[PDB]
Amino acid sequence: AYHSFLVEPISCHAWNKDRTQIAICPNNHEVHIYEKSGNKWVQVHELKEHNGQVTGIDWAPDSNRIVTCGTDRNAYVWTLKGRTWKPTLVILRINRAARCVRWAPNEKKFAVGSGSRVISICYFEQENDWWVCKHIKKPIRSTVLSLDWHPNSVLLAAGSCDFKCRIFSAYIKEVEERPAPTPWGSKMPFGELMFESSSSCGWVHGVCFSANGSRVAWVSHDSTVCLADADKKMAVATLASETLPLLAVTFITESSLVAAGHDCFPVLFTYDSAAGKLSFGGRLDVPKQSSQRGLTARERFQNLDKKASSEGSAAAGAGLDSLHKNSVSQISVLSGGKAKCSQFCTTGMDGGMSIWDVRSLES
Amino acid sequence: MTATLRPYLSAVRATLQAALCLENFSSQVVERHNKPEVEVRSSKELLLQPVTISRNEKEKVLIEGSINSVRVSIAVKQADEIEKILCHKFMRFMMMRAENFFILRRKPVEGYDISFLITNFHTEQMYKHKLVDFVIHFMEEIDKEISEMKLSVNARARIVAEEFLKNF
Amino acid sequence: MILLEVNNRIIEETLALKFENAAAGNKPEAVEVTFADFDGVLYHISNPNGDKTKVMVSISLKFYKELQAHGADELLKRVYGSYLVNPESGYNVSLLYDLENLPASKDSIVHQAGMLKRNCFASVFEKYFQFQEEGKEGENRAVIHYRDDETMYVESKKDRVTVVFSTVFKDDDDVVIGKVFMQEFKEGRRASHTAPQVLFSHREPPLELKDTDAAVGDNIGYITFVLFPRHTNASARDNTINLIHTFRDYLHYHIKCSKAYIHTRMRAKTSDFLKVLNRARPD
Amino acid sequence: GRLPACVVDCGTGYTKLGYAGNTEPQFIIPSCIAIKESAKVGDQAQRRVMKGVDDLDFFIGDEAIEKPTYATKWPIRHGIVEDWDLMERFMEQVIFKYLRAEPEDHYFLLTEPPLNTPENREYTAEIMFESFNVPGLYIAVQAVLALAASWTSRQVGERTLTGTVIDSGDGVTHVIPVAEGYVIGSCIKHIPIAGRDITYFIQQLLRDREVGIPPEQSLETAKAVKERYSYVCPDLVKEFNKYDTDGSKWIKQYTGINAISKKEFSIDVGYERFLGPEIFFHPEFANPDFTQPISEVVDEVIQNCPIDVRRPLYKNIVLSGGSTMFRDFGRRLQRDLKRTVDARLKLSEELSGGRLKPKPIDVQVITHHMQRYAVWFGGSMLASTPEFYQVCHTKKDYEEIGPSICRHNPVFGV
Amino acid sequence: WXAXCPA
Amino acid sequence: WXAXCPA
Amino acid sequence: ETTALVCDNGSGLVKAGFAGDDAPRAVFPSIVGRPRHQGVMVGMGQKDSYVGDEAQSKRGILTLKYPIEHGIITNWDDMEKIWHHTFYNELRVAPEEHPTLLTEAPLNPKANREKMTQIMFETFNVPAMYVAIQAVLSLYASGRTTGIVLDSGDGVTHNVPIYEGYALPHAIMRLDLAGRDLTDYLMKILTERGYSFVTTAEREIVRDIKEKLCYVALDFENEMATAASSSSLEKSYELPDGQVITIGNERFRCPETLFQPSFIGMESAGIHETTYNSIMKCDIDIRKDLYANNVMSGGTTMYPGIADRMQKEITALAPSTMKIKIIAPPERKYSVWIGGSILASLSTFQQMWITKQEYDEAGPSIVHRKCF
Amino acid sequence: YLMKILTERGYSFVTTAEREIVRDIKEKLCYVALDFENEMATAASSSSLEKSYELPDGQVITIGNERFRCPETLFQPSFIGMESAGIHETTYNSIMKCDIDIRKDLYANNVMSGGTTMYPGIADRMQKEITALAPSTMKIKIIAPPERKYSVWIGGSILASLSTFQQMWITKQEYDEAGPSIVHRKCF
Ligand SMILES: Nc1ncnc2c1ncn2[C@@H]1O[C@H](COP(=O)(O)OP(=O)(O)O)[C@@H](O)[C@H]1O
Ligand SMILES: Nc1ncnc2c1ncn2[C@@H]1O[C@H](COP(=O)(O)OP(=O)(O)O)[C@@H](O)[C@H]1O
Ligand SMILES: [Mg+2]
Ligand SMILES: [Mg+2]
């Protein structure tokens, strides 16, 4: 189900509620929106007032708002007014950069994984017609690359590059209420460290939560996968293999798990019930790819001038779909939530996009 | 090269493939930038420990690591003074036209022979395995090039001598 | 140029420019120029005094003392006639042209003056060859070290003549290249029929130089050319003298030419390397 | 009895040559270089790779023009050089055949245009130190050499360091002021039009306005410019109608000689007698990018430097360079500069009233010999100065630091 | 050879 | 042509 | 440093391989060809010089020249190029890793040996090497200590009488006649038949023809008479272009030049006469042993029936009171290489090598005293 | 080759009649060049070397460098593409293959014959080339009789006139009894 939207890479992707609209960063000072047309994709809009590079996008299932969180230490909350899109300036008080962003299930606040050693949380205010920003800086010691949220919206996990993957506890009493009892802790006030990684296991590039809110998993640059099971006495499970570093995290159900990265194709994992150990699953996407070429009498002589005439586009990665699918940027979900996920999509640094399935394989 | 160079090439190729992974990291220390981290040496947070793949005292290679770039430095197997001179001159002539390469540096690391450079800006606009293949191929072909240069200079000396002696 | 020339073209050019307008009345064209050539010798052209009707040429030979001791009376009348006068600059041979007297020849005189350095250098080698030819008792061997720190020695016995060369290289870069260059000099003989034997020695100086205080050391090679009358008679004498005198600069120039050749070859190979690299960029 | 150093002034046009401590550049030859190239087709992966000794089988200089089986290929093009292997070949050929100087026991001074990039200077210095092993080297802009040579015009004993020089060139003519030995770095402008494109325009017009010449012997026909055949013109249209009215006495004739069949061919001389040299003050004719005169450029560059130096600078403008040999050039430049400066002074006085009268600014152009070559004498005096032997970069400096010692430029600094 | 026969 | 054939 | 490489610079072919293997790993002819035409196409700047099987394949547009002529090198650049090719492209083994063994014909000029040693020690900086004789290696391969060697190579034919534990340097005879002269004579006679061949490509073609359709004749006159009845001896060969050439008497005429050098005009004697003279010059007692053992090697002695003719001629010349035996192993082509490999494998020979230190301190003259 | 180059000049000749015409042209207006490069340079100054020939139809053809280009093919067979050597090289190789003592006599006597060696200056060029190749210690002489065209016929007539040769002939009786193979053994 491969498709191409641009030769150059793409930074981040965002989708709407009906999976009919797409957001693609062209690796330039703008962002584009693509819409479905029968069985085809075509450009619809063109949003641009940012003079820097965009590196984070997200979508609101109900509010239909889009946030551009990137360089220039700024962030604009896009909203739809009739048949056109307009910006909404926000203030974040950042000095270095901002990469990743994420909204909340209830659409009341959004967080930015800023590169200034700080994590910012903001909420809507009608008084000054602005977006106020708070800061979390106590335990943070380096950049944060991945953020994920919990149903109640009070627990936040902010992966960083300091061997740690920590949950936080943010509660703005202005637009938040007391959450129900949770196994983790006490839902303490904003700006505090709840718990830290058990030990040093590589950096962090992604995080994933569960509907029951009792299991957290993340990946690392050290070719490792972790699963913090809080239902038990903070049982921690680990797994490793010879695969290249992963750069994404997501799971299907309470036991499944999915990930992708420089391996160029999806890799599937699973978690046991009581054994406290994971396992491995190989190329759940498909068996393998194929390769082809042509004579190209013009090319046979065109390539000899610069490259060798006998040379060609064939590569060892053609057989296992490792030729053009250069790396994987992140992952998303298609249907429902993180319970069944009948379909899953992934982003590619090649500048394209692709879709997959979880039941079409039919074991 | 099965019994002489094959294992060395395999090991260095595997190391490069593992360390060829790169990603874009917004500048953490200097306002807003995406400049290479290895050259700056600002934060030890991103840097990875150096590695070396070598089998003799006078020949060596170095493999660096970072989010933005990976740097590799080689040391050739030069024995005689003519070999050193020819290697230096050939590398200098390679430097003088390094702009078209888009991969190579502009001056070798101190105390070492030529070194290369990679970045996230050179990984998508260019293929991945082709670059490592080219680095390998250069490593093998250096000896051929130096031997060919040596025989060429010897032939030149022979021809000039023959041309002069005829007059007598 | 392959065989380095012996005629300095600077004097040829300046004398041609002067003489082409000579028949134009009272035209002094005061000239005062200083030059330099191989062997670390300085030339000088300058009028003797305010009288610009006479032009003088002089030399600053390093080993001039040996020439004066030997005596070059042959050179004072054979090649140079009455237009040679006692030294002025530094006790070194200096000539002048008398413009008031009609100069009949134009090219012959200029050519004769062009080879001044070799013309004076031959005074010793040709005389040694005459000594061995005439049957006179073999004249005592002599050593002639010119401006270069190296040395030259010659032995003139009966039935043959000998010459040995001492080589010194200054920069460490060119030492090995010159060693390689001279290694194949002693062997290349498949394209020469009537040519002398050639040999190379650096570790063991020849037994001839043990007594003589010639160039002795460690990083010094030796080259000897055996001489026989078949290539040292009155016909093939000038050619041999020119070849031996122009030996040093010949080696130097061809070393630089080889350097340029290898530079060109590596520059050519860079293109092949770039072509191989270009396989990484997409279509 | 110390050996003199060597003086060389390389460039796009006729390369000057000779030794230091002398009053006349002995050798003045073009940059033409021969080569045994022919028609291969594989010319971008083996440019030449001449087998055996054929690599050096090439002549040089005036003798290289009359070799009709090789290729005359100029290596230089208005300072910048594409391939420098030909330059190295020319340098070795000259030093050995013509100069006959051993590099290991001599000092070489070289001259380059001010716009030369640092890379070219660095790499040529590296080439010299590697191959020639010259003990010392020094590179400097040619303006100061021209200023030093200008002292011979009158009153040599009267030291006069201030002034400005607008030098010519085969492909470049530059403007550089001097303020008591110290020049201004930012007040330098590079002019692309020079004494070559002028001849291109001359031949282009001639190939249509006249017939009776062979394609080969074109430049020799186009070199009427170097003859008495070009006068400058205070007015353009006036002389145009003068020619179009009489067109009998003002027209000259050419009597060149063919170099192949030895058959005489003649052509008349028309409007090109002045248009070429007039292009200097109207560069828009040839180069569309640079639609900017010269005299106004001179005043602008002289008006972008401190107040205390503006006054003496206008008083000393040196006429040095081949392209400046045109008659009445100085009169036109002086008159234009005087007009513009007087107008500026009057405008400045108009806004602020006063019965005073400032002493008029004096602008004078000096005509003298040495115009064809003003860089050689400067290099000779450069070599003769003992301090040159101390400022020259040494071998050990290049040994480990690299060839960056020659990267110093007058318009750079951090 | 050098004398006698070619080689 | 000039000799042989027309052209 | 586990094994050594043995290279045989044959006058017409090069054999190389590792020390220990029973068969060579590289067998290509000594050809150094260069383009003869101008070249027009732009998409190829390829290899101004050509060497090896590549030269054989594209020989139609190249001026093939053999670097080695009759056992003595004429062009050193070509030999260095072939050495580099064999070391790198084919063997893919660096010179420093292992030492090299070289072989040469007897009675060769000392200049060739000194130049070869100097080039090997300077250019490739081999850790150590040695110089030997093909005949002694033939003895080692044959597993015998006494006999007479008939090393009839492509460029030189020579004999070296030997006895138990010692040799006889004063009874060595070298004959310039070899395969190249036979090929030239074959071309000359093929001209008399009606087929013309001049250039080097047709030289290779005629070489193959001789390799495939030549044999020796027990009796010359009887074979000529049977040729007069030419209805059972003529054979046909298929040329690359498809033309068919019929060869009759030429099959058994060219080989007879070995026994009758007068055909080419050389004032010498045949191999039988030279071997008889060499054996006679030896001591009387060792003559019996030399007769009882006669080893032959080289690519010029594979013609069927050569052994029988040699035996008949020697018995006719020698007294008819003893027994003369000819030994003709079916692998004489690579006997020299096998002997070199076995000699290198010998434990006692691990110290006889010549290393860089002693060579540099002493000089090139050391090899001269190393086993003559 | 002369036809091919005459094509490059602008004159075309294909059929056999023009072959005879070009043969006559070569017979009348061709000569050898002592130095190829010097002659080419002087041709660059083409004002004293070009010559005109009158065709049967009256057309005039001007021939320049072609006069001294085609004969050079003898010394440079590479022009036609033949991988061989020139006449000088072949003669040097033939003389070298001979015994050392007879080399002096062969050098001292060099007879040439045939219709292809009448080009003026050929003898001088051959002498210069042989002396350059041969050692410069002896004397090399070239003999060029002015009647070499019919030298073979004169020699045949003289041989027939010889009394001793009156018996070496081959008659019908011996030929019939022996067969055609007799001539093969008759003086090779
Ligand atoms: N007397 C002259 N009249 C007109 N043009 C001249 C005259 N002398 C030189 N030129 C022109 O000036 C140019 C040479 O100036 P020059 O500066 O010496 O060249 P370069 O820049 O290499 O030093 C020549 O191209 C020539 O056309
Ligand atoms: N099958 C064969 N039969 C007869 N002669 C052969 C055969 N193969 C090669 N030859 C001849 O032997 C020569 C090559 O054998 P070789 O022993 O390698 O020569 P060398 O002595 O230089 O090693 C060739 O020149 C060829 O003429
Ligand atoms: Mg200039
Ligand atoms: Mg052999």
- The DSSP line for A190-255 is SS-EEE--SS-------EE--TTS-EEEEEETTTEEEEEE-SSSSEEEEEE-SSPPB---B-SSSS
Q: What is the CA angle G21-G22-G28, rounded to 5?
A: 85
String of DSSP letters for D393-412: BPHHHHHHT-GGGGG--TT-
- The answer to whether the CB of A55 falls within 8 A of the CB of A66 is no
- Tokens found for residue H181: 């193979």
C-alpha distances out from residue B24 to A13, A69, A222, B21, D348, Å:
16, 16, 18, 11, 58
Experimental method: cryo-EM
Task: Please give the single-letter amino acid code of residue C207.
Answer: L
Three-state secondary structure call for residue D105: helix
Per CATH, the homologous superfamily of domain G183-271 is ATPase, substrate binding domain, subdomain 4 (3.90.640.10)
Is the distance from the beta carbon of residue D277 to the nearest atom of ligand 1 less than 6 Å? no
Residues β-bridged to residue A217:
A208, A227
- The phi, psi pair for G191, rounded to 5°, reads -65, -40
Q: What is the CA radius of gyration of chain D?
A: 24
- The phi, psi pair for B73, rounded to 5°, reads -125, 135
Cα separation, C159 vs C175, in Å, equals: 36
Q: Which of A241, A239, A236, A245 is nearest to A206 (CA)?
A: A245
Q: What is the CA angle C225-C228-C231, rounded to 5?
A: 90
CATH number of the structural domain spanning residue D209: 3.90.640.10
Q: Which residues of G touch E5 (CB under 8 A)?
A: 70, 176
- The answer to whether the CB of A112 falls within 8 A of the CB of A56 is yes
At least 3 CB pairs under 8 A between chains A and B? yes
Q: How many CA atoms lie within 13 A of B71 on its CB side?
A: 18
Distance from CA of D46 to the nearest CA of G (A): 7
- Tokens found for residue C249: 């600069």
Nearest CA to ligand 2 atom 22: G10
Residue of D170, D320, D328 to test ligand 1 pocket, by largest number of atoms within 8 Å of CB: D170
Q: What is the CA angle D340-D345-D346, rounded to 5?
A: 95
- The answer to whether the CB of D127 falls within 8 A of the CB of D400 is no
What's the full length of chain G, in residues?
372
Of C63, C97, C131, at which residue does a domain stop? Answer: C131
Own/partner pairs for D62-71, CB < 8 Å, 24+ apart? D62/D29, D62/D30, D62/D32, D64/D32, D64/D33, D64/D34, D65/D30, D65/D32, D67/D34, D67/H41, D68/H41, D68/H44, D69/H37, D69/H40, D69/H41, D69/H44, D70/D34, D70/D35, D70/D36, D70/D37, D71/D34, D71/D35, D71/D37
Residue of G28, G137, G333 to test ligand 2 pocket, by largest number of atoms within 8 Å of CB: G333
| Declared resolution, Å | 3.9
Q: Are residues C123 and C75 in the same domain?
A: yes
Cα separation, A69 vs A53, in Å, equals: 9
Query: Which atom, in ligand 2's list, is nearest to the CA of G152?
Result: 21
- The answer to whether the CB of G50 falls within 8 A of the CB of G34 is yes
Nearest CA to ligand 2 atom 12: G299
Nearest CA to ligand 2 atom 23: G10
Residue indicated by tokens 């122009």 = C246
Q: Which of G344, G323, G338, G286 is nearest to G164 (CA)?
A: G286
Residue indicated by tokens 């050039």 = D329
Mutate to test the interface with D, among H35, H40, H42, H47 (most CBs of D within 10 A): H47
Buried b (16+ CB within 10 A) or exposed e, G203-228: bbbbbebbeeebebbeeeeebeebbe
Distance from CA of C244 to the nearest CA of B (A): 10
- Tokens found for residue G128: 């150590």
Cα separation, G253 vs G247, in Å, equals: 11
Q: What is the CA radius of gyration of chain E?
A: 4
Query: Which atom, in ligand 1's list, is nearest to the CA of D321?
Result: 17
Query: Which atom, in ligand 2's list, is nearest to the CA of G30?
Result: 22
CATH of H1-87, picked from 3.40.50.720, 3.90.640.10, 3.30.70.1110, 3.50.50.60, is 3.90.640.10
Burial of D346 (0-12, 13-18, 19+ CB in 10 A): exposed
Task: Please give the single-letter amino acid code of residue G372.
Answer: F
Q: Are residues C101 and C163 in the same domain?
A: no
String of DSSP letters for G290-320: HHH-EEEESTTS-STTHHHHHHHHHHHHS-T
β-strand D365-366 against D317-318: which pairing, if any? parallel
C-alpha distances out from residue G272 to C240, G139, G286, Å:
52, 20, 18
CA-CA-CA-CA torsion sign (C236, C237, C243, C247) = positive
Nearest CA to ligand 1 atom 21: D169
CA C278 to mean position of chain CA atoms: 51
- The phi, psi pair for D343, rounded to 5°, reads -60, -45
Cα separation, C244 vs C247, in Å, equals: 5
- The answer to whether the CB of B24 falls within 8 A of the CB of B34 is yes
What's the full length of chain H, in residues?
188
- The answer to whether the CB of D168 falls within 8 A of the CB of D193 is no
Query: Which atom, in ligand 1's list, is nearest to the CA of D172?
Result: 21
Q: Which of G131, G136, G124, G82 is nearest to G103 (CA)?
A: G131
Residue indicated by tokens 């992604």 = A206
- The phi, psi pair for D269, rounded to 5°, reads -115, 130
* Chain C residue with minimum CA distance to A312: C279
Q: For chain D, say whether G37 makes contact (Cβ under 8 Å).
A: no
- The answer to whether the CB of D313 falls within 8 A of the CB of D305 is yes
Q: Are residues C124 and C145 in the same domain?
A: no
* Chain E residue with minimum CA distance to G155: E7
Q: What is the dihedral of CA C278, C279, C280, C281, to 10 degrees?
A: 60
User: In the 8-state DSSP scheme, what is residue C5?
Assistant: P
Structural domains in chain C (count): 2
Task: Please give the single-letter amino acid code of residue A247.
Answer: L
- Tokens found for residue C149: 């720190």
- Sheet of A13-15: strand order equals A13-15, A21-24, A31-37, A40-47
User: Containing H/E element for C113?
Assistant: helix C107-114
| CATH number, span G136-182+272-334 | 3.30.420.40
- Tokens found for residue A20: 């009919």
β-strand D136-140 against D107-111: which pairing, if any? parallel
Task: Please give the single-letter amino acid code of residue H171.
Answer: T
User: In the 8-state DSSP scheme, what is residue D99?
Assistant: I
Residue indicated by tokens 């359709």 = G213
Cα separation, G146 vs G161, in Å, equals: 8
User: Do the domains at G2-28+70-135+335-368 and G136-182+272-334 have one common CATH topology?
Assistant: yes
Q: Are residues C121 and C45 in the same domain?
A: yes
- The phi, psi pair for D298, rounded to 5°, reads -60, -50
β-strand G50-51 against D267-269: which pairing, if any? unpaired
Task: List CB contacts of G263: < 8 A, sequence separation 6 or more.
Answer: G185, G256, G257
Q: Which of D204, D166, D221 is nearest to D285 (CA)?
A: D204
What's the full length of chain F, in residues?
7
Q: Which of C94, C74, C73, C71 is nearest to C83 (CA)?
A: C94
Residues β-bridged to residue G294:
G148
Residue numbers of the domain that contains C96: 1-131
Q: Which of C136, C117, C132, C123 is nearest to C227 (CA)?
A: C132
Of H11, H14, H18, the CB nearest to F2: H11
User: Containing H/E element for D380?
Assistant: helix D376-384
Residue H104: how many CB atoms within 10 A of its CB? 11
Q: Are residues C29 and C66 in the same domain?
A: yes
- Chains contacting H (3+ CB pairs below 8 angstroms): C, D, F, G
- The answer to whether the CB of G181 falls within 8 A of the CB of G264 is yes
Q: How many CA atoms lie within 13 A of A3 on its CB side?
A: 17
β-strand D107-111 against G72-73: which pairing, if any? unpaired
Three-state secondary structure call for residue A140: coil
β-strand A84-86 against A75-81: which pairing, if any? antiparallel
- Tokens found for residue G369: 């005293």
Is the distance from the beta carbon of residue D29 to the nearest atom of ligand 1 less than 6 Å? no
Task: Please give the single-letter amino acid code of residue A273.
Answer: S
Cα separation, H109 vs H104, in Å, equals: 9
CA G213 to mean position of chain CA atoms: 20
Is the distance from the beta carbon of residue G213 to the nearest atom of ligand 2 less than 6 Å? no
Residues β-bridged to residue C95:
C57, C84
- The phi, psi pair for G340, rounded to 5°, reads -60, -45
Ligand 4: centre distance to CA G108 (Å): 13
Q: What is the CA angle C52-C58-C61, rounded to 5?
A: 170
- The answer to whether the CB of D262 falls within 8 A of the CB of H47 is yes
Buried b (16+ CB within 10 A) or exposed e, C196-210: bebebebeebeebbe
Task: List CB contacts of A297: < 8 A, sequence separation 6 or more.
Answer: none
Q: Are residues C126 and C266 in the same domain?
A: no
User: Containing H/E element for D203?
Assistant: helix D197-209
Nearest CA to ligand 1 atom 23: D169
Domains of chain A: 2-357 (2.130.10.10)
Q: What is the CA angle D134-D137-D138, rounded to 5?
A: 165
String of DSSP letters for A295-328: --HHHHHHHHHHS-TT--S--GGGTTT-SS----
Is the distance from the beta carbon of residue D113 to the nearest atom of ligand 1 less than 6 Å? no
C-alpha distances out from residue C248 to C38, D160, G234, G299, Å:
9, 48, 67, 49
Ligand 2: centre distance to CA C113 (Å): 64
Angle between helices G271-280 and G284-292 (to 10 degrees): 140
Q: Which of D131, D125, D283, D92 is nearest to D194 (CA)?
A: D283
Helices (H), chain B: 6-19, 37-40, 81-96, 129-165
String of DSSP letters for B47-70: ----EE--SSSS-EEEE---SSEE
Residue indicated by tokens 């008939």 = G150
C-alpha distances out from residue G97 to C118, G82, G87, Å:
53, 19, 11
Nearest CA to ligand 1 atom 25: D170
Query: Which atom, in ligand 2's list, is nearest to the CA of G180?
Result: 25
- Tokens found for residue B113: 């022979």
Cα separation, D286 vs D193, in Å, equals: 8
Residue numbers of the domain that contains D211: 196-285
- Sheet of C142-143: strand order equals C142-143, C152-157, C160-167, C221-227, C198-201
CA C100 to mean position of chain CA atoms: 33
User: In the 8-state DSSP scheme, what is residue G54?
Assistant: H
Q: What is the CA angle G86-G91-G95, rounded to 5?
A: 80
G29-69: in CATH 2.30.36.70: yes
| CATH number, span G2-28+70-135+335-368 | 3.30.420.40
Cα separation, G332 vs B35, in Å, equals: 69
Task: List CB contacts of D313: < 8 A, sequence separation 6 or more.
Answer: D162, D163, D164, D177, D179, D302, D305
Q: Which of D184, D272, D196 is nearest to D232 (CA)?
A: D272
Chain D stretch 385-404, residues whose beta carbon is closer than 8 A to a beta carbon of chain B: 402
- The phi, psi pair for G35, rounded to 5°, reads -60, 145
Beta strand residue intervals within chain H, DSSP E: 51-54, 60-63
Cα separation, A3 vs A325, in Å, equals: 11
